[PDB]
């Protein structure tokens, strides 16, 4: 079970937060600032795995913008990386050569790709075509 989804820049600026566990905003800032401090203070041959507070945390560096999640520590761990890679391909297919400013200016569309890809922490569409087709159909409703 994915407890949260975090997207933070290299400088530490929060670009996307998501909470699949309802913890309050002071706890949100505490946990978010802690995770931002942890991942930015770790090297480049460290497996992209952190055991942080009963969570086998799954992050990945794709660019200066860093991505972060944490699956429940009883599941497989590499599939969370495949989830993040699939969502990268979702942003690339709906946005088109997805820039940082595409994530900056059009963040709500990335939130909606996340909504039509994962609710509750789990994958709701495994097709890389049906999900982007459905969000282009919902955009076609406008």
């Amino acid at each position: 079970m994915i407890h949260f989804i975090l997207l933070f820049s290299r400088q530490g600026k929060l670009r996307l937060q998501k909470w699949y566990i309802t913890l309050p905003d002071k706890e949100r800032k505490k946990i978010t600032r802690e995770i931002v401090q942890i991942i930015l203070s770790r090297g480049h041959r460290t497996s992209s795995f952190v055991d942080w507070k009963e969570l086998k945390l799954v992050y990945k560096r794709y660019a200066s913008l860093y991505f972060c999640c944490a699956i429940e520590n009883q599941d497989n761990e590499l599939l969370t990386l495949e989830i993040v890679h699939r969502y990268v391909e979702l942003l690339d297919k709906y946005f088109g050569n997805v820039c940082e400013l595409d994530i900056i200016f059009n963040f709500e569309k990335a939130y909606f790709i996340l909504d039509e890809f994962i609710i509750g922490g789990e994958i709701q569409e495994t097709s890389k075509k049906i999900a982007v087709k459905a969000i282009e159909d919902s955009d076609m409703l406008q």
Partner: peptide
């Protein structure tokens, strides 16, 4: 800048 790079490079 360093922001205009696309992520996945399809």
């Amino acid at each position: 800048k360093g922001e205009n790079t696309s992520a996945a490079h399809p």
